[PDB]
Design a binder for this molecule. Structure first.
Ligand SMILES: [K+]
Ligand SMILES: [K+]
Ligand SMILES: [K+]
Ligand SMILES: [K+]
Ligand SMILES: [K+]
Ligand SMILES: [K+]
Ligand SMILES: [K+]
Ligand SMILES: [K+]
Ligand SMILES: [K+]
Ligand SMILES: [K+]
Ligand SMILES: [K+]
Ligand SMILES: [K+]
Ligand SMILES: [K+]
Ligand SMILES: [K+]
Ligand SMILES: [Mg+2]
Ligand SMILES: [Mg+2]
Ligand SMILES: [Mg+2]
Ligand SMILES: [Mg+2]
Ligand SMILES: [Mg+2]
Ligand SMILES: [Mg+2]
Ligand SMILES: [Mg+2]
Ligand SMILES: [Mg+2]
Ligand SMILES: [Mg+2]
Ligand SMILES: [Mg+2]
Ligand SMILES: [Mg+2]
Ligand SMILES: [Mg+2]
Ligand SMILES: [Mg+2]
Ligand SMILES: [Mg+2]
Ligand SMILES: [Mg+2]
Ligand SMILES: [Mg+2]
Ligand SMILES: [Mg+2]
Ligand SMILES: [Mg+2]
Ligand SMILES: [Mg+2]
Ligand SMILES: [Mg+2]
Ligand SMILES: [Mg+2]
Ligand SMILES: [Mg+2]
Ligand SMILES: [Mg+2]
Ligand SMILES: [Mg+2]
Ligand SMILES: [Mg+2]
Ligand SMILES: [Mg+2]
Ligand SMILES: [Mg+2]
Ligand SMILES: [Mg+2]
Ligand SMILES: [Mg+2]
Ligand SMILES: [Mg+2]
Ligand SMILES: [Mg+2]
Ligand SMILES: [Mg+2]
Ligand SMILES: [Mg+2]
Ligand SMILES: [Mg+2]
Ligand SMILES: [Mg+2]
Ligand SMILES: [Mg+2]
Ligand SMILES: [Mg+2]
Ligand SMILES: [Mg+2]
Ligand SMILES: [Mg+2]
Ligand SMILES: [Mg+2]
Ligand SMILES: [Mg+2]
Ligand SMILES: [Mg+2]
Lengths: 97, 152, 124, 244, 205, 118, 51
RNA sequence: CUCUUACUUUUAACCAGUGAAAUUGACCUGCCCGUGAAGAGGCGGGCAUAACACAGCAAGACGAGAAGACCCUAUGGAGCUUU
RNA sequence: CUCCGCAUAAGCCUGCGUCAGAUUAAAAUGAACUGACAAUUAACAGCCCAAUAUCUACAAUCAACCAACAAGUCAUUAUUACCCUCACUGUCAACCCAACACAGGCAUGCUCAUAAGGAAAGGUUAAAAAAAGUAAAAGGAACUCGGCAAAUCUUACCCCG
RNA sequence: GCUAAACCUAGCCCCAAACCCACUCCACCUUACUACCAGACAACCUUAGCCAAACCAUUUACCCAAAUAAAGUAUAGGCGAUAGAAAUUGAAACCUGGCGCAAUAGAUAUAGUACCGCAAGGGAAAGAUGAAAAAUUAUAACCAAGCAUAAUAUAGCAAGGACUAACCCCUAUACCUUCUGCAUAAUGAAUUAACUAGAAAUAACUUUGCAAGGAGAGCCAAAGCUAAGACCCCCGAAACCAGACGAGCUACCUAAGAACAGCUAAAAGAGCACACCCGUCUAUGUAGCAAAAUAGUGGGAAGAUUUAUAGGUAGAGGCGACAAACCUA
């Protein structure tokens, strides 16, 4: 019980496909490109996360002021509640002061 | 007609007429004993006894003395595998009595003699099965279960 | 303990409820004093059934027939077939004017008619 | 997920499609305009910079309006931009004392005015401020015609404006039908507020009143197809004759 | 009508049959079979068409296509790729053994050229008249759609009109004369009905 | 039943005949009147704030005198706007899962049939 | 406490498959002999009489 | 009550059919004295001791049940009264 | 045995009718469970009414004597308008509210002991303890906080209200 | 050997992109889903409180229209907790992807269904053959606890040391938590499977880079500066506030109804005493017949009586022959 009786299908991986063979290309677009572009501009994803890093409270605060006016009502309400909970935890709870 | 809007009537207005009626009635066999003159029908809910009379006299040229109707409830007790109730459609029943002393008896629409086919029927697959079934015989007890195919 | 997910019908409720609810049958009159019902002969639908004697058409059609294509009828198709020929003839004759459009078949209004087209006042 | 457009822009997206997109241009411009009203229940700074006494530095200053609640009975009169002030106070003007709910209401009066362009008297409810504003404009007609919408703050005051502007554009002779000279003299005093009838008939109307109006201007029974095909036929026959 | 669950598994037995009901009750939920999407236009295998089996128990054999199942891209050929099953069994009698065919994928069969009985690949084309047809890649020749008896079973060439079957001369006769009247108005003139009373106007809202 | 197809054939013929007659009446109504619908109606907002096509009924008195018609509301108040958005966002979530699911099936449909790249 | 066994099996016939089906069962062998053969009595004796 | 007794029914026990609940650290689950978180089936010193069901009893298992409602604590609540 | 029973209202909604069954009751005939088929037929009941003005002091109680207060449930006329008439709906059951096929709850009419409707014992044995009853020598509250309970059919007094 | 075990799909999550938005007929605001008659009711109005301040009483962040920076600076504040700008500066932008879940996960979802609740509302569980089932006398077996095959023999936390030998001999006061201290007769735990709990700044340390300069504008700098690595849990109250839902139970009231034998006295908020209403005492019952009952005994029973139907009063409240009663166990 809790462990499969047969072996799973083999995990075949192509180490020489397009995405793996061309990974890391254009990471030095600035050094070798006269600094016309910055490597952070090659990052794709959420517009509030491009070239930026923070903790959950910092991520949640940043998302609310950048796309908060476009969010669904239920998702926005939960975001505000998450910011309230995190504000209390980080600023009032912990081992160190 | 059903599922249609009826033109409203006012005093002194034209007669209401339907040229193509979508009422479809089915004559049924009574479950219990009924008088000879009485006939039983299943009609849609929207239909009235007044319409059934004019509907029968006009389309089928049948004189009717009396018409009575009742609404029969369909059981909503049946449940599916999701425990959701299944509704048997409620239907209306009509009892019609003939006018001039005519008597109606429901005919036997499935005579056994007619159902039985005088002309020989020779389905290929069935013939194959029947032939083989007959030819093969039960195991002789004295043989004790020894395969019979072997002639030795 | 009530079934709120079951079809509300005249079979449910007290006496006053069961008499006021119906099944979809159209009325053919009104109630007068004394609970006396008055039937209106003009409110009862009259079946216009034709004579079926010597009628060639039958419920089914033989399979030995061509597979003609479907050409849904349009307003323009009906205008050219019936209205256009009469107009072309009068156009060639030299006597055509909009005032006579009613003579060609056009209906300026629907009032004063037994079978109006919009809002229609007749059954199928 | 996310919405393509922000929610605060949804109201202006409704003015780009539908029947609202078919409304006049000048009316649509008057809607999106958000000109600031005139201060009534608060004093403005007057300047853009000041010298903070504590540190003696040139600080910037901004005028923040005070929310005003206009009851529905304010749209049947002329309060002059006044309204109820829904706010709080400190007991005995002491920050350390508890805070209480306070509502300041204006003093209303039932007066009777006369309009020269309309030749009719109205019994409107007003405030003392409205009476002073009518004395600075030298009449009720100038007050109604000079004061903008965001300062009138009344649907009845904006309907009077539309009534006056329509007579200045149509040059309605119903005003004193038996006194032509007198009539002409009245229209020569308010000639600086003349607006074309086409643009003066949409003044004051709300979005719900304008849509209904525009709907009535477009409401018309559909043209029968019997007439359209006849036009195509006759027009087609004539072209055929030329080729012959 | 048709009552098929979202992920109904099509099989050899037709839907709605007693065998399919037992095999596919309303409640079961099985892993969906993956089927290569093929445009109805591109499909080139029809019933009554000879095909050669490439892979299977009996490869290199040519047989007629008796049934095709589009949902699973299956082709059934008579007498090939057939296992054996006892039919008509009972508790006392073992039953009769018969060969039963197994479905073949459209990739495990290959159409044959009529001129040369060899597997070939075909690509659709158009003739002079414009009728679309399938033509072999190698030694291009026309391969018409084999005639197959209709599903219902009616044979037009052997049809006998019954007492409730309208004749061809009465079902094709044209009696309609385009006018500007409704069935109601046109029928009241023929039947002979007359109604002088007028219809008073009502309000609609 | 001996031949159940007989009933299916008649029902198809009864529907086809009803389609032809209605086709001739619809075309005849466009020529005399130009209306596409035989029954009057209008687009209106219900009490719930959703668009609906109102089919008119036949009455004997005008609408401003009818007791029962004036109790019916064809306008939504401002407390409906929030529910209209919540109901719009509900439909968007459904439509998003439907579109992302289809993309997944197609991406999983190439692993087993890798010759579909073209 | 309302769960039951999934016992809904019903008994059907295997003699014939679904009706109104264009596909039909294909048979390779016949069921029985077309003309019965009766070897003449005394053929066992003729085994010795090879000629 | 002195001072209890007899009989009947139910229950009861046995046979047949159907078939719950709280409870349960693990248990191969004895007595005396002593010891010890101060009241021991389990530790020390002695005594006893083939295995096993059924029916009864209620001295013990600080027996089961309800995170004591008495008492105190909490910069924990609430109701009522008021100079 | 008869705690009732039949009917109406209310509520419920096909929930012991036929056929079939691998399902089911303690019970592999029955069935309230499953599948199919059938079924309640209006005269009872429900669903009513043209307008304007106008009229309506004198209870009921066998309503007659009589006696009351708490002072009561029933009525029209005038003028105008108005010749087609029997539609629609309820009608089943061993049934509702209590998680149950629950010793509970449940309005009205008739029956007032039944003409209707029902079965306390699965079989055996006849220990304790326990429960419900019957009888009891002599004594008769000595019991006990108390005549609780049972039997019997009784006096007087006090406190509080 | 049974019970079971095992599986990989269904779909789901986070982004990106793109604004979004119906239809056969018939029916549906009256008791919704009801063909057909005299109406005129109409929408707007500061959120509060929990919490933090170790009480609490002023006060206590909540997208508000450009990322960064200016800056946690000016400034506000029981000048406490904490709150907190602007001028000015000024960037990028190719939907079709995933070091996301894989049936106790991931949406609650096979479904807002079944079921619970008068109502508002709450809210599940689960599936698995194969190319073919028109191959079903089929897809092998091996694995949890629980049982069976196969009950038990002096003596003891059950074992360890051992032994020719299972036991007999010798040694040995279960575990966690909580405590000055527990074999403790202190807490929790029948057992199996799965699920179930340490999140980060300041400075400093360590290892690279460059170096009086460092850093991909801002900032720091009297060896500093840049980058990286590495430290801060889970479940649980009674409560408080806002907005909805509730008087089919019950408390009181309104409208129009119904019932009360027989005897005595005939005057009765009179007596005896059925139906009916109540619930005095006793026994039984105590996971029951019953989340308040059964048997007997009792109180009232023409009145301030009992009772069916519809309606009304709603929580900062109602109602109350005040029991702090009752307002859906
Ligand atoms: K912290
Ligand atoms: K005795
Ligand atoms: K004991
Ligand atoms: K205890
Ligand atoms: K029922
Ligand atoms: K009970
Ligand atoms: K009897
Ligand atoms: K506190
Ligand atoms: K779930
Ligand atoms: K202890
Ligand atoms: K304890
Ligand atoms: K313990
Ligand atoms: K513990
Ligand atoms: K009420
Ligand atoms: Mg009836
Ligand atoms: Mg037993
Ligand atoms: Mg315990
Ligand atoms: Mg001791
Ligand atoms: Mg014992
Ligand atoms: Mg005991
Ligand atoms: Mg405690
Ligand atoms: Mg406190
Ligand atoms: Mg507190
Ligand atoms: Mg009657
Ligand atoms: Mg009956
Ligand atoms: Mg019995
Ligand atoms: Mg017994
Ligand atoms: Mg005894
Ligand atoms: Mg005695
Ligand atoms: Mg004594
Ligand atoms: Mg005495
Ligand atoms: Mg004593
Ligand atoms: Mg006593
Ligand atoms: Mg007293
Ligand atoms: Mg605090
Ligand atoms: Mg700025
Ligand atoms: Mg799930
Ligand atoms: Mg095991
Ligand atoms: Mg020992
Ligand atoms: Mg631990
Ligand atoms: Mg201690
Ligand atoms: Mg110790
Ligand atoms: Mg112990
Ligand atoms: Mg403790
Ligand atoms: Mg950390
Ligand atoms: Mg507080
Ligand atoms: Mg409150
Ligand atoms: Mg009530
Ligand atoms: Mg009640
Ligand atoms: Mg009253
Ligand atoms: Mg009496
Ligand atoms: Mg009395
Ligand atoms: Mg008495
Ligand atoms: Mg009371
Ligand atoms: Mg008191
Ligand atoms: Mg008290």
């Amino acid at each position: 019980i809790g462990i499969r009786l047969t072996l799973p299908p083999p995990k075949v991986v192509d180490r020489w496909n397009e995405k793996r063979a061309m990974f890391g290309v254009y990471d030095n677009i600035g050094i070798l490109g006269n600094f016309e572009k910055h490597p952070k501009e090659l990052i794709r994803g959420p517009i509030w996360l491009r070239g930026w890093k923070g903790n959950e409270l910092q991520r949640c605060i940043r998302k609310r002021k950048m796309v908060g006016s476009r969010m669904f009502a239920d998702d926005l309400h939960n975001l505000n509640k998450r910011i309230r909970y995190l504000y209390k935890h980080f600023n009032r709870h912990g081992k160190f002061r | 007609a059903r599922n249609v809007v009826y033109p409203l009537y006012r005093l002194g207005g034209p007669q209401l007429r339907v040229f193509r009626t979508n009422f479809f009635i089915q004559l049924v066999r009574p479950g219990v004993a009924q008088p000879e003159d009485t006939v039983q029908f299943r009609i849609p809910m929207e239909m009235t006894r007044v319409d059934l009379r004019n509907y029968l006299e006009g389309i089928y040229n049948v004189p009717v003395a009396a018409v009575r109707t009742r609404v029969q409830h369909g059981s909503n007790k049946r449940r599916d595998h999701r425990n959701v109730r299944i509704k048997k459609p409620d239907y209306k029943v009509a009892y019609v009595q003939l006018a001039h002393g005519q008597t109606f008896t429901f005919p036997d629409l499935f005579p056994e003699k007619d159902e039985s086919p005088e002309g020989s029927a020779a389905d290929d697959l069935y013939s194959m099965l029947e032939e083989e079934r007959q030819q093969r015989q039960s195991s002789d007890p004295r043989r004790g279960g020894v395969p019979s195919w072997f002639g030795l | 303990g009530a079934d709120r997910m079951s079809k509300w019908t005249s079979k449910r409720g007290p006496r006053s409820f069961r008499g006021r609810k119906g099944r979809g049958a159209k009325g053919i009159g009104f109630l007068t004093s004394g609970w006396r019902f008055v039937q209106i002969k003009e409110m009862v639908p009259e079946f216009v059934v034709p004579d079926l004697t010597g009628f060639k058409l039958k419920p089914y059609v033989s399979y030995l027939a061509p597979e003609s294509e479907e050409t849904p009828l349009t307003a323009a198709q009906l205008f050219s077939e019936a209205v256009a020929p009469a107009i072309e003839k009068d156009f060639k004759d030299g006597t055509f004017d909009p005032d006579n459009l009613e003579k060609y078949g056009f209906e300026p209004t629907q009032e004063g008619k037994l079978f109006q087209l919009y809002p229609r006042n007749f059954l199928r | 997920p996310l919405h393509k457009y922000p929610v605060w822009l949804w109201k202006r997206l409704q003015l780009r499609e539908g029947i609202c997109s078919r409304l006049p241009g000048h009316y649509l411009r008057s809607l999106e305009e958000e000109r600031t009203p005139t201060p009534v229940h608060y004093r403005p700074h007057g300047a853009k910079f000041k010298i903070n006494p504590k540190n003696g530095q040139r600080e910037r200053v901004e005028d923040v309006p005070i929310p005003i609640y206009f009851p529905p009975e304010s749209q049947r009169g002329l309060w002059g931009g006044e309204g109820w002030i829904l706010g709080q106070i400190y007991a005995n003007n002491d920050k350390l004392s508890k805070r209480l709910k306070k509502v300041w209401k204006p003093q209303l009066f039932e007066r009777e005015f006369y309009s020269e362009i309309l030749d009719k008297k109205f019994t409107v409810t007003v405030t003392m401020r409205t009476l002073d504003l009518i004395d600075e404009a030298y009449g009720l007609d100038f007050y109604i015609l000079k004061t903008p919408k965001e300062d009138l703050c009344s649907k009845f005051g904006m309907d009077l404006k539309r009534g006056m502007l329509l007579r200045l554009a149509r040059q309605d002779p119903q005003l004193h039908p038996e006194d032509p000279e007198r009539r002409a003299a009245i229209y020569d005093k308010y000639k600086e507020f003349a607006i074309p009838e086409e643009e003066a008939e949409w003044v004051g109307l709300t979005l719900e009143e304008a849509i209904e109006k525009q709907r009535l201007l477009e409401e018309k029974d559909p043209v029968p197809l019997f007439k359209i095909y006849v036009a195509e036929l006759i027009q087609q026959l004539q072209q055929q004759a030329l080729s012959e | 009508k048709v009552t098929l669950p979202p992920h109904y598994r099509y099989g050899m037995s037709p839907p709605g049959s007693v065998a399919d009901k037992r095999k596919n009750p309303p409640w079961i939920r099985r892993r969906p079979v993956v089927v290569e999407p093929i445009s109805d236009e591109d499909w080139y295998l029809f019933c009554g068409d000879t095909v050669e089996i490439l892979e299977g128990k009996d490869a290199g054999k040519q047989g007629k296509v008796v049934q095709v199942i589009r949902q699973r891209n299956w082709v059934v050929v008579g007498g090939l790729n057939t296992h054996y099953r006892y039919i008509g069994k009972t508790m006392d009698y073992r039953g009769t053994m018969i060969p039963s065919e197994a479905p073949l994928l459209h990739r495990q069969v290959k159409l044959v050229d009529p001129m040369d009985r060899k597997p070939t690949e075909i690509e659709w084309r158009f003739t002079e008249a414009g009728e679309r047809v399938r033509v072999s890649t190698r030694s291009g020749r026309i391969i018409p759609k084999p005639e197959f008896p209709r599903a219902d079973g009616i044979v037009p060439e052997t049809w006998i009109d019954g007492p409730k079957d309208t004749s061809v001369e009465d079902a094709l006769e044209r009696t309609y004369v385009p006018c500007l009247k409704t069935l109601q108005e046109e029928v009241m003139e023929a039947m002979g009905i007359k109604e002088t009373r007028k219809y008073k106007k009502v309000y609609w809202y | 039943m001996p031949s159940p197809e007989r009933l299916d054939k008649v029902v198809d013929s009864m529907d086809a005949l009803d389609k032809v007659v209605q086709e001739r009446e619809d075309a005849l109504r466009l020529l005399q009147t130009g209306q596409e619908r035989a029954r009057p109606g209008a687009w209106r907002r219900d009490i719930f704030g959703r668009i609906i096509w109102h089919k008119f009924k036949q009455w004997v008195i005008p609408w401003h005198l009818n007791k029962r018609y004036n109790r019916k509301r064809f306008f939504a108040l401002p407390y409906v706007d929030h529910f209209l958005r919540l109901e719009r966002e509900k439909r968007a979530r459904i439509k998003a899962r439907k579109e992302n699911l289809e993309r997944k099936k197609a991406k999983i449909l190439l692993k087993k049939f890798p010759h579909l790249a073209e | 406490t309302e769960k039951e066994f999934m016992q809904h099996a019903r008994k059907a016939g295997l003699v014939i498959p679904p009706e109104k089906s264009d596909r039909s069962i294909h048979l390779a062998c016949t069921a029985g002999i077309f003309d019965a053969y009766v070897p003449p009595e005394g053929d066992a004796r003729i085994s010795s009489l090879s000629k």
